[PDB]
Amino acid sequence: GPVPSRARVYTDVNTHRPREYWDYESHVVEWGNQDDYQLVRKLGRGKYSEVFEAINITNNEKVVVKILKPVKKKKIKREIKILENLRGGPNIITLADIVKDPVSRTPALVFEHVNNTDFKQLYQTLTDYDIRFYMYEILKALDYCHSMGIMHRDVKPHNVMIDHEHRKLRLIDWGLAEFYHPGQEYNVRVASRYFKGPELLVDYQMYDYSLDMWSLGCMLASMIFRKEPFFHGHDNYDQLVRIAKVLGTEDLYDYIDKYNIELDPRFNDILGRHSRKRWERFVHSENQHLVSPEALDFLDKLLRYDHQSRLTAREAMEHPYFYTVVKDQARM
Ligand SMILES: Brc1cc2nn[nH]c2cc1Br
Ligand SMILES: Brc1cc2nn[nH]c2cc1Br
């Protein structure tokens, strides 16, 4: 059987809180009236999504309304409880209200207004400095939610709303976020293909906060190398092969042996043997301005097979890559 794992940081934070904090199934929701709002327009968030710009009639304030997709209410209360727990945290989207349509009875979340400019639309046109600035901003949100015992699990450019004129950033879509409890085995069918950590791909269930750090690595790699996605798999099996071709197969199989992972039979033929590639392989004339020794050292320390080996959010924030950002923050 597989070898147990525990989080390097924030391991027992939920244990030391009242049951009410994390026992989201016992949470009682006071449902508001969706009649306090009027939808203005549908926000283009993809096919699955049902997000709208709206106006709160009571005070003429712009808001964003997310109509919850028919789901186990377990998941609904989970997203609500996580949002409520993280409310007011650095770069976390603010849940304003919780409502139901009186006729349909369908649940909906009302958020603080933000522009519909997600990071995917801006993150391939950024300067060196701005990549570091916004990465550091994302890291604030990750450290906070992890410090509060929550892993996001869907960290990707599409879930990062950015107001580039006022330099503001919000981490959004907490619908896959879950509370970390040491020993718990989690669902591995979370996150999007290109940002799925190796632990998800080999079906290692006892993962932690460090999942989000892999996803952050994938985003960083994609930005500095101008390669979208960085790991471009056909499916979940070929995704790990794409990773394997960069990180190499030696650390992969070492990782499998360390945690005694029963590797799916399909993987046997498709992985092969590959060297660990030096990051220089991905630098070219059109991306050389975004790539530095500091960026490559930072990237390397996020993208590890072994989830234990990856930088924590706080450790990442104190990496040399962010020195000029930290400096400028204190100046202001
Ligand atoms: Br306002 C509002 C109007 C709606 N029509 N159908 N669903 C709705 C949800 C909200 Br909130
Ligand atoms: Br825009 C937006 C989209 C979201 N998806 N899930 N939560 C969200 C919050 C906002 Br604000």
Numbering used by the authors: 3 to 334
List sentences from the manuscript:
It can be efficiently inhibited by halogenated benzotriazoles and benzimidazoles. The holoenzyme exists in vivo as a heterotetramer consisting of two catalytic α- and/or αʹ-subunits and two regulatory β-subunits.
5,6-DBBt adopted a single pose highly similar for all pH values. The hydrophobic faces of 5,6-DBBt stack on one side against V53 and V66 of the N-terminal lobe and on the other side against M163 and I174 from the C-terminal lobe. The bromine atoms of 5,6-DBBt are pointed roughly towards the mainchain oxygen atoms of E114 and N117 and the sidechain carbonyl oxygen atom of N118. The most direct evidence for a pH-independent binding pose of 5,6-DBBt away from the hinge comes from the crystallographic data that shows essentially superimposable ligand binding modes backed up by anomalous scattering data. Summarizing, thermodynamic studies demonstrate that at a pH range of 6.0 to 8.5, 5,6-DBBt is mostly or at least partly anionic in complex with hCK2α due to binding-induced pKa perturbations from 6.9 in solution down to 6.1 in the complex.
